[PDB]
Amino acid sequence: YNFQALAELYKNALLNDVLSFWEKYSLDWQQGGYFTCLDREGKIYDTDKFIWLQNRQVWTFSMLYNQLEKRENWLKIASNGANFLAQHGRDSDGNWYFALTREGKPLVHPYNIFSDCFAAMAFSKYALAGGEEWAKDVAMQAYNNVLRRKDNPKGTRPMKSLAVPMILANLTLEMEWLLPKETLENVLAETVREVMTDFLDQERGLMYENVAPDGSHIDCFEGRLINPGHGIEAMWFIMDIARRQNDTKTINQAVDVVLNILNFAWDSEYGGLYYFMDADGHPPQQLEWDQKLWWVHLESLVALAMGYRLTGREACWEWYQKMHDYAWSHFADSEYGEWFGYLNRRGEVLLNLKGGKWKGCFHVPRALYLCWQQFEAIATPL
Amino acid sequence: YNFQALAELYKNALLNDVLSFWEKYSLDWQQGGYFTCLDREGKIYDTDKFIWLQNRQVWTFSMLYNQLEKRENWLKIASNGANFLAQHGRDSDGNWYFALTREGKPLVHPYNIFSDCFAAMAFSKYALAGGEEWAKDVAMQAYNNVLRRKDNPKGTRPMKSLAVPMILANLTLEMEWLLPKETLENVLAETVREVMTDFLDQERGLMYENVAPDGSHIDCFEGRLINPGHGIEAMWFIMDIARRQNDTKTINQAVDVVLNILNFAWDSEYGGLYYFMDADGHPPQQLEWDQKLWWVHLESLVALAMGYRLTGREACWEWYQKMHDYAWSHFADSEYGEWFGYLNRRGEVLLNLKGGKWKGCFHVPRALYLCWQQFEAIATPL
Ligand SMILES: [Cl-]
Ligand SMILES: [Cl-]
């Protein structure tokens, strides 16, 4: 039960390893923004700017500045992204691009709303960290675009996706200081009700990625799809929100679901959770289904640490230890820093990178910070 | 040098194994069209109708009826698809859907032109096999939509894809009997010139998937991408077209390129060709890059058999044998019929299916038929 050693492990990994890696290798001080396409050793292999990741990195450094320590270098790193993004990130109608060239010329315009999501979250927390009022309105613009486009984010077979209420819930938390208290309260209750009613299958105790509007299943590739890590991440989002109202019943239901997903999705031959599974045991359409991904395992560490902190349930601690041994031994790279993102089913490195189009300065530092928080809270009552 | 035994191997695999599998398990005689989502044993795991594959299956049975033997059952199988597709396959503007429900209700409308491509090819050959004149105009409609939309199939970084002239070349061959002789001649010469000028890198002797309009490379994920099997398939397309004009120089250049790609893309640890590679040795964005796919290896068998038949070059025969031993021992399923589509890098079955959203009655029977043709021609001068 060495909670204090775990707290120290996560604190040291965040401050001395992971943040250091991004500080040393990712800053584009000449043109603004960040290089995310970094190989195992931190070498740059592509200079394109993927806006999700640009915004996530602004958020991470702004958050840590605001909540942990006002280190000048963290704020300067956040500014290097925020200024670049404010100048180049949006089309004439204020919609966020998906990708730019190094110098900020637009490459890709997205159909989704997740670009706007990450922009709202980043500029909200940058506004707070930097005391930059202009960033508040950038954030508010991006946020109303998400709620406006929520119901069709992009007749025969109506379906809706878990990702939409998920990101809108967690985002609303990040927008709290800028929103009417009632608006916050309502969206939070509604998104939580939708996630726990429609996407949670009461009979199987599992989260589905896509359901009909009334929560019923549809027998098709989309309607059979399970993404173990995605559902686990949603559940700690739900825990975090339920904790605010001390809704212990909802916290415990979320923990039930996390344990169900882990028991369902663990690879008994090689260890780790599968990336995708078909709920009915049919062959998935995803060629990457059996792969072992960094964030799937990190968000599981967060959910189990948070579940144990919030409920004290022994099963969370037992699963925490099992997940810890697997994730730390397979993804963490002690020699060069940071975590590998992509392993094959056997746990072998599949892409020799620390960042890319979809991995940047976000899931790893956020998860390490959150786990540090849970174990520190466990060791030291507030 | 047992050419006759190879001819017999391919003939028997096509007629007694592969066509039999699709005849036994894939026909939707109640509603029309075909079930492609078939597991290892032929069991159906999804009833959706993926229009690419519906059209490809109409083409395969129509082609064999027209070129091999007028078996009544083959034409009835082709009709079961063609009638279903004519009734349900197109929107009000005559554009082909990407997917329908079992009964033909539209699910997905595609942005690309490859749906129209496969529809033009299918209805062209169905028109010929069935003597159905109405199918000619369905085909001609679909074909002019492809040429009309060829230049933007769906300012900062202009790029074009190999798939477009590739499919337009091979398609033009399948439309020959319906087109002005001059129109055929021109498109064929132009598509061949574009493929062999712009997408073929003269210095590396390799095919690139995406280049700038003038054929120059762009240093980005798309511009570094190699798809070994895709380039090999394009090269036998080029061989087939060059053979028509007895353009021996072009035939031999295409064979040069096939041999270059095989030497570049062969997995020296586990055997087989990689699905995707980054030309500059950076980490790919494709999580499926190291996988071993049925059509990648089948189109390589076709290209090597055809290359050897057309040129007699010993290297083609040596690579044929190497590829044959790998592909037949890893993909062919003697117990239940047909070929697995999807193996991991080690050659282990990754998806336990014989068909799905992207694998249907096309690459396997076409490749087995073409290889039968090459070895029969080698054994028996015409
Ligand atoms: Cl990330
Ligand atoms: Cl196919």
Residue numbers in the entry:
A (entry chain A), B (entry chain A): 3 to 156, 165 to 392
What does the paper say about this structure?
N-Acetylglucosamine 2-epimerases (AGEs; EC 5.1.3.8) catalyze the reversible epimerization of N-acetylmannosamine (ManNAc) to N-acetylglucosamine (GlcNAc) in both eukary­otic and prokaryotic cells. The reaction follows a deprotonation/reprotonation mechanism involving two key residues, which had been thought to be histidines, but which have recently been identified as a glutamine and an arginine. AGE activity is greatly enhanced by the presence of nucleotides, in particular ATP, which serve as allosteric activators.
In this study, we report the determination of the crystal structure of the AGE from the local strain Nostoc sp. KVJ10, which we refer to as nAGE10. In contrast to the pAGE and AnaAGE crystals, which both belonged to space group P212121, the nAGE10 crystal belonged to space group P42212. The structure of the monomer was resolved for the amino-acid sequence from Tyr3 to Leu391, with residues 157–164 missing. The fold is that of an (α/α)6 barrel, with the helices connected by small loops at one end (the back) and long loops at the other end (the front). Gel filtration showed that nAGE10 was present as a dimer, and a melting temperature of 72.3°C was determined by DSC. The nAGE10 dimer, which involves the front faces of each monomer, differs from the back-to-back association presented for AnaAGE and pAGE. A comparison of the assembly parameters calculated by the PISA method indicates that the front-to-front organization is more favourable than the back-to-back organization in terms of interface area, number of interactions and solvation energy. One of the principal consequences of the front-to-front dimer is for the ATP-binding site. Independently of which site is used, the localization of the ATP-binding site at the dimer interface is the determinant of its role in AGE activity, which may involve the oligomeric state of the enzyme.
